[PDB]
Design an enzyme around this catalytic site. Structure first.
Site, short mmCIF file in Angstrom:
data_model
loop_
_atom_site.label_atom_id
_atom_site.label_comp_id
_atom_site.label_asym_id
_atom_site.label_seq_id
_atom_site.Cartn_x
_atom_site.Cartn_y
_atom_site.Cartn_z
N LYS A 35 -4.39 7.24 1.02
CA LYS A 35 -5.12 8.13 1.75
C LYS A 35 -6.56 7.83 2.55
CE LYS A 35 -2.15 11.52 1.13
NZ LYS A 35 -1.28 12.03 2.16
N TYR A 56 -3.20 8.60 -9.49
CA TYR A 56 -3.09 8.89 -8.17
C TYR A 56 -2.50 7.37 -7.49
CZ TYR A 56 -2.58 11.50 -3.69
OH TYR A 56 -2.18 11.97 -2.52
#
Lengths: 246, 244, 248, 257
Positions: C164, C157
């Protein structure tokens, strides 16, 4: 170089029954650092076992006390007061859950078993912290043990996970209540030191290995020592980074 | 527009003793959504109070049961099974701590009081969840109430904070054990329903019980079908603040 | 029976480029609830795609605007103001990280790629929230999407996880600043929506992956007056996956 | 008694500009433990200041490098490698946000200011970690600084809170990626401390008073306490700890009402 000299300091280590345990590792580091240690043991029939622990540490004072008996805890601390004059550190390595509760599902935990697990594994910290309060000298502290299951679901941990959740919340409230007098309260969330998790930790943890009991002993020493004078109400992880992994 | 129709759904709401409570608020919303509600009451001497509550809900079955008594809980669920045939929702709004435990410091909590608080406030979720498991239908759910004192020190909440920590941890383990059969388990962490909260909260006001009731309805409704093992905060954002 | 009627409500949905996006699922639920929707599209060359999305929703107003260009965001909200008169909901479903950053290790992320991911994926919420503030009516709200990689390490990720984390912290600070005027700000941490999917299903308590409709319903709920007491929250709709401390 | 002997250990400490700073406190404890320290300084016009710092530490190498310049960071690490041969510890005490971003509301942060704050305060950890990787020996480690604002809302920290949230996530990912080679990465979440860095945060003074009156210990921490935690995390005593954010704030963050 830096030196950690705890000579003159007094520690009470509870819930230890074997040399291969987190509680004993901390006691060993405390002794290595120069502190005098007192070890509690559950019943007179366990005295010989305790004696061997005392010898393994290179000398320790023993006291009988079952953490579910308030009278015995009173006796323990009166004994500690008489023998040490006071106290600096309290190592809470007490943990227990009936076999019945640990086998099967958490949702199937019997009332009596659930309450005993919480009583021995979590309430005991409160019971001993209260009695240790009058004896704890400024700069003193309490350290207990916990595990990742308290925050995330680790199958087959059942009520112990809930007990540790209760223990950690207790650590925060105790840190708040004992902090004004200069006593710190922290928890150590150790990784595994069963084979299910143990092996997966070595494969998934950032360090790609399991921690050792010595690494827990070292964190325990640090947290109790004056080097950690500004740290309290904390849950510090020594799990090779396992818990940060998704 | 969209609609949440819970017609035919059955709910068991426990721990409710007053109309001005989070548990009642949730029961009221379930009723408004069309579900039928059964209220448990602790002792027969409280029957009249219970009846007032049932009437205020527009009708609700009543079942006597003290959560510290396993035999009573067995009887409670036998009666629910007979009246409803099955169960869709279980609202756990049970919370209690002896007065002595709530007076003074947490470190001074007596053994018996500490255990009673944990038994009634935390273990009860386990006790009822186990008995509801066989009755709960697919899409079924269990929701409980908690407070942020479980994670942060709120002076004077004492043992209740520890009970809520145990409760929240129980929610996670129960979600794991009941999820395979399609039952969801979640907790609602509600703010007070004081003036400091209003001044500190992002919304600069306290939440209402209706707002807790709406979250409870949502979590139980099929709209939240993908949500389980969660502790959802409905506190006007208070808990996100690191100061005041 | 309870009803959620958002007729008369206005929503601006951003970052949607396909019907399989979580942003589209939320837009569809809002429309189904009765609200009017506006969709932004990054560039004129993507106008065709936006038009199909609008049609798939049963009707929607379109606006061109690249979230990295402040002047275009200025024009977007001027356009929204003129066509809607105000705004009720803002769905931030914007996310991007250069493929170079997503290939390899996080430690090897290049400076420009790292900054662009943070700019598009996190700063854009600030940029749009600032411009929406004057238009958002009482009871209004902003909802964004996130993933648990923000708190737990989910290899591959990479920078998006960090983005995020920045997005979630931004959600908290924005909730704090926009809350006194009646605007709610929340994030939805969604699980994967369908090898990889099988793994999640095996570990999740519900033993299945979530659906885009389940994300849409949580988005509707959070924006609706039913969630009037909820703000600054990160709500997980992942079939309970993130509570597991061990893969099953 | 026990001893922590870091003789022969090499450390690079970045972002230090004053003796009254958390970064300096850690460098001081490292030196006291026997480690050799190298300090980076941002620009040649600050050489005199950097020299006073080196002198105060009882000696330390100096290297000029601005963390926003990749070529400069390459030269920095080329220099460290030439002087040390290798590296054991890297202390990241770099933090910056434009005044305009810190003044006013977070929602009003300008694009360029926001990106610069993130670039200097968070991305720099990544940039220096990547360059330090080949130089770091087994038992090596990286430690950075952060604070409560990353997780809970503290008025007036604005973009720095966001940057720290990004920094903390970076710590977890870097712990994962460098852990295999035996390198640990951790963050120290310090409570308020009267530092030069604190002056650049409008919401500091507020926090400072609050902590002393609200924290369990009913007092603020000192830079030495942060220095001790840094020494511990970098030393072999913390060999099983990585990817962790450790709070040294007198227990303030566990408090609620």
């Amino acid at each position: 170089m830096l030196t950690v000299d705890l000579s003159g300091k007094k520690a009470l280590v509870m819930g230890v029954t074997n040399q291969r345990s987190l509680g004993f590792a901390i006691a060993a580091k405390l002794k290595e650092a120069g502190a005098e240690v007192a070890l509690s043991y559950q019943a007179e029939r366990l005295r010989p076992e305790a004696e061997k622990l005392a010898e393994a540490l290179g000398g320790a004072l023993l006291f009988r006390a079952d953490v579910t008996q308030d009278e015995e805890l009173d006796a323990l601390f009166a004994g500690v007061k008489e023998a040490f004059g006071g106290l600096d550190y309290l190592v809470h390595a007490i943990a227990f859950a009936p076999r019945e509760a640990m086998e099967g599902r958490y949702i199937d935990t019997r009332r009596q078993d659930w309450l005993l697990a919480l009583e021995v594994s979590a309430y005991s910290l409160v019971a001993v912290a209260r009695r240790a309060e009058p004896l704890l000298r400024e700069g003193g502290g309490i350290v207990t043990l916990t595990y990742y299951a308290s925050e995330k679901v680790v199958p087959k941990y059942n009520v112990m996970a809930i007990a540790k959740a209760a223990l950690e919340a207790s650590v925060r409230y105790l840190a708040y209540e004992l902090g004004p007098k200069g006593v710190r309260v922290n928890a150590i969330s150790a990784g595994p030191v069963f084979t299910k998790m143990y092996d997966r930790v070595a494969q998934t943890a950032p360090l790609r290995r399991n921690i050792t009991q010595e690494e827990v002993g070292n964190l325990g020493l640090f947290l109790l020592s004056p080097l950690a004078s500004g740290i309290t109400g904390e849950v510090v992880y020594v799990d090779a980074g396992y818990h940060i992994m998704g």
